[PDB]
Amino acid sequence: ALKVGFWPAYSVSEFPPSKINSRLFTHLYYAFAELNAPTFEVRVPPGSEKTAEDFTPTVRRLNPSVKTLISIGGGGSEVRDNFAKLNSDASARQRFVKSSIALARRYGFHGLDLDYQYPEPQLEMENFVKLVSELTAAIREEARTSGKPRLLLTEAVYFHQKLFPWEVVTEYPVQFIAAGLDWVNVMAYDFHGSWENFTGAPAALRDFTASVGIESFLAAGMPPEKLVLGIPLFGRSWLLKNNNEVGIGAPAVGAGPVDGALSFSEIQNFIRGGAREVFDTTTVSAYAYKDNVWVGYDNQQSVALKVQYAKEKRLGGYFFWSVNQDIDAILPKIASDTWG
Numbered sequence: 001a002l003k004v005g006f007w008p009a010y011s012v013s014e015f016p017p018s019k020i021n022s023r024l025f026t027h028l029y030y031a032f033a034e035l036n037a038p039t040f041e042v043r044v045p046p047g048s049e050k051t052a053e054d055f056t057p058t059v060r061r062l063n064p065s066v067k068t069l070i071s072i073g074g075g076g077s078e079v080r081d082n083f084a085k086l087n088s089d090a091s092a093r094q095r096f097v098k099s100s101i102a103l104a105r106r107y108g109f110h111g112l113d114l115d116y117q118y119p120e121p122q123l124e125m126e127n128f129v130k131l132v133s134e135l136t137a138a139i140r141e142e143a144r145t146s147g148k149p150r151l152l153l154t155e156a157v158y159f160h161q162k163l164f165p166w167e168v169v170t171e172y173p174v175q176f177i178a179a180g181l182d183w184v185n186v187m188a189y190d191f192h193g194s195w196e197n198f199t200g201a202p203a204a205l206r207d208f209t210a211s212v213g214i215e216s217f218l219a220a221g222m223p224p225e226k227l228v229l230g231i232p233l234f235g236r237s238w239l240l241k242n243n244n245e246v247g248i249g250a251p252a253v254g255a256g257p258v259d260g261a262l263s264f265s266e267i268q269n270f271i272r273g274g275a276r277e278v279f280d281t282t283t284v285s286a287y288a289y290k291d292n293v294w295v296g297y298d299n300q301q302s303v304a305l306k307v308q309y310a311k312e313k314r315l316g317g318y319f320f321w322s323v324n325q326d327i328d329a330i331l332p333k334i335a336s337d338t339w340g
């Protein structure tokens with residue numbers, strides 16, 4: 001039962017690794033090492049070496065059994081462009097593979113993650129397959145030469161097995177992934193948000209839903225234990241067109257605070273300051289509103305329902321993005337209690 005959380009290094013001054021309740025997790029990710037084009041000597045951002053080294057000993061103090069991975073890349077156009085340049089150059093792929101493995105060992109991580117959004121179109125998937133195949137082989141070779149258990153290898157995936165469901169240009173090769181990786185982190189969120197003119201459930205379990213995306217990976221043949229269901233610790237926000245239309249599907253005029261996203265902890269403050277929370281059974285989600293601000297998110301009820309869903313679907317577990325955004329670890333606690 002994988003209970004996974006991502007800790008973003010940007011948050012260090014407000015939420016250092018020491019604040020993570022690592023009792024509630026089996027695996028915790030450092031986000032992110034950088035690709036460091038053009039040499040592709042993968043590294044943590046210069047200046048953050050101490051933070052990266054101390055991460056694993058720190059989180060293990062509260063739960064020695066917890067393991068860690070370092071995630072390389074992250075969402076965003078610069079990372080995507082760097083992976084696309086990397087994956088087309090055999091020499092660069094070799095430098096990336098060697099340096100990534102060395103990085104994980106250097107800082108005491110138990111594994112590596114790729115976060116690449118996204119390996120599309122078809123050329124980019126084909127080249128990503130070359131990178132990942134080479135990385136899997138080198139991980140096995142390093143275990144052989146060091147005598148240590150092999151590094152874990154995971155990657156972030158889009159919510160759906162097809163890139164993209166409305167216009168398929170490529171798709172994740174599930175048998176390849178199952179053979180090469182320990183699991184994938186299914187990004188079952190950002191379905192709805194301020195790019196749209198109406199409020200919606202940004203991580204709806206059902207209704208662009210988490211269950212349809214999960215179904216697509218299973219139908220393609222992914223072993224269910226290789227899927228880890230993502231659950232956001234942030235909400236997507238809108239400004240309402242009219243303060244008396246406050247439900248799902250209400251008209252909106254742009255992004256709410258802060259640039260369209262609010263941490264769970266900020267949402268708790270929003271509710272304590274007078275916003276009304278509503279559970280939406282139709283989507284398995286929550287929303288809250290006050291005056292012209294509306295936010296959709298996951299709450300204690302929807303998280304328990306999503307985690308039970310993952311269990312019923314025989315998934316490997318769940319992950320949170322990102323742990324600094326529930327400072328009191330409310331949602332990680334209910335998730336852990338739900339699974340058992």
Ligand SMILES: CC(=O)N[C@@H]1[C@@H](O)[C@H](O[C@@H]2O[C@H](CO)[C@@H](O[C@@H]3O[C@H](CO)[C@@H](O)[C@H](O)[C@H]3NC(C)=O)[C@H](O)[C@H]2NC(C)=O)[C@@H](CO)O[C@H]1O
Nearest residue numbers: 075076117159164166187189190191192193194195208260
């Ligand atoms: C052809 C068409 O209209 N397609 C629609 C899709 O574009 C839309 O996908 C969503 O698009 C938005 C905006 O590009 C994505 O939001 C971004 O997501 C990233 C990563 O999750 C996040 O870091 C950004 O902050 C966020 N940007 C903003 C402005 O919030 C979102 O991920 C896309 N979601 C999915 C599931 O692809 C979908 C779904 O709304 O609808 C199609 O009709």
